[PDB]
Amino acid sequence: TTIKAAKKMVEREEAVVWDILDEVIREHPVLLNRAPTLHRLGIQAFEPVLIEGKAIQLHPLVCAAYNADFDGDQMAVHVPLTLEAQLEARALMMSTNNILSPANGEPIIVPSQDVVLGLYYMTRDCVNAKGEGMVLTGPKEAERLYR
Amino acid sequence: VTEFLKPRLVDIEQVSSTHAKVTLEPLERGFGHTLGNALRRILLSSMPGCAVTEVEIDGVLHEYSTKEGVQEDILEILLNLKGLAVRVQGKDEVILTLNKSGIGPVTAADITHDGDVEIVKPQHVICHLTDENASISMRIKVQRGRGYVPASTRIHGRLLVDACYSPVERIAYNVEAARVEQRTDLDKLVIEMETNGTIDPEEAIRRAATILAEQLEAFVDL
Amino acid sequence: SVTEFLKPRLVDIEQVSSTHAKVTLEPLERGFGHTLGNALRRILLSSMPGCAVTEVEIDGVLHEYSTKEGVQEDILEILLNLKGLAVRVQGKDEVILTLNKSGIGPVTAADITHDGDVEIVKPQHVICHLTDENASISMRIKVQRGRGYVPASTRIHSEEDERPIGRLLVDACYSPVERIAYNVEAARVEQRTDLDKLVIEMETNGTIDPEEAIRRAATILAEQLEAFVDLRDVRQPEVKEEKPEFDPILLRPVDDLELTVRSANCLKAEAIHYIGDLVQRTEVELLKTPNLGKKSLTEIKDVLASRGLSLGMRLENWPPAS
Amino acid sequence: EIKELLKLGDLPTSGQIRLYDGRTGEQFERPVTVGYMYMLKLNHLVDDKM
Ligand SMILES: [Mg+2]
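A: This is the predicted complex of the input protein with magnesium ion.
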């Protein structure tokens, strides 16, 4: 009932406060930012997902967009609190909106590495590999045949 | 406490009535991967069913061929037959005949209506035909086998085809994280599977679970 | 046969050493080899009931960042060796072990005051080294049975358990298994072909028993599998529950409120064990209750009416169902 | 000389060993490199930033 009681409850982290927190951010966006924000993409909007530890996970594609390696580079978070700002982050700076650089009409979401390697390995052709010369009733059949 | 956690599953999504998506939650730190992988490996290979394995066109006895009357090569016909899911009764092996003439698509429903088999989709197209004066027939033998047995492994005149006994067409498990009030992260399993329609997907999961449990039965206590 | 094939069975518990053990499940039909192999490896590595040390206490030391005049290593090294020490409890689930030692030489596992329900798996494991004639250590060692691995940080449960300064928390790492290698081979089936015998070697603490570990892991797998051996749309949430709001602590006797036994007999002098009956009993029956003066009455007024309850509250719903 | 030293042990000269995914149980093709490398820890630890 009282605000000080709620402060105490958060201080103790009762088993209900986590459900409450998970509820209060179900759609509430958030802002992630890199230290040198050279261009417009240096600040983007995401939806947070609760995790453990103290690190800040972020999609690899946008981390190629932030010009952000994983050499220990730090990132700052921000929470848009007014309704206008929440909806603004959801409508303008959400990652699913910035997919082309304002500089060039090229796509900023480029699979950088460790997946181009994966797909490239998945799409090649050994001249004599186990299974060569069959007929497949469809892609799912090939997937089952492989697994 | 030497007592584990049992899931409170949340959804059996039955989109298309032959391609289901089951979720399960929550599972212990690693049990998601082990359960998903065991179920997947059992369902793929070791899950008995029935499917065609012998094809015999009584006019052409070669995979390669120049057989008119049909605008599809014999390879297309073998491919179509590969997916002709037929659920068999107490019989373990039976041959079927498909003598047909006409104009267009020779489809499954033209099979002679035996009493020991049941096609799952009579609306399955098998092979399209030349529109006039074309009556090519063929017999087809099925078998009650274990799983996927390719032709190259069966090759040792009578034509062969890729035996696919496993009723499952595809299956993939994906494990996400799930929360318990203070617990960090427990596996939340999501298995999407797609079968021949000869058995509903959840029924196939049930069958695989039963087969694995009756395999395990030799070691457990309770 | 064609369908409904045959199940395997354990046919060897061959142990090459005290720890390195081998078992040979057979026969696996086909593809079941890798299936059960990887599954059992994951289960075994994941969860087996171990009983490593969890809480230690050495009379001389205060915090594990100190030393002690006489012991060659630091308290930190002692705790790490302790974590390394393994033991097998039989009777109870948690136990306390006293280790007393004096004189020059190495203090190893055998030197502790063993019991019957507790057995040291290997005694030669060195704990520390006393390097002085009149140097001695006595230490209490809490050893509790658990599953998995819990660090020393999150194991805290209250704000007074650590208040005993000598209670040093050693982050428990109890899992008897250390590595689980396995491989399939052509089983010598009397009449069939390409059946698979699965050979599993476990390198362990020697604490757990190999065949026992296998059967426990298999039980775990079967129990977890029973979830969707009969799966259906099920949901534990049953909104709008219906239950009587009678407080269950009233079912207990009054003496369960952390007070003496003379006041207990005092509430046994009025033949009032129940709290669900004393709740219909105001303070109009206390000085008339036999021998309730100042001290025992002070206990009655302190330990009862402070826990949120009141000494006598009118209610109309009791007892469901005592 | 590294090849000769590996030959002293019973390890492959290529320094690559057929591994196995602990999740599935099937081996990675293309035998992967595995060894014993020295690894430091730097005082940029997370508890000083978060
Ligand atoms: Mg950097």
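Residues 3-12 of chain A form the longest helix (10 residues). The beta strands of chain A are 30-34, 43-46, 75-78.
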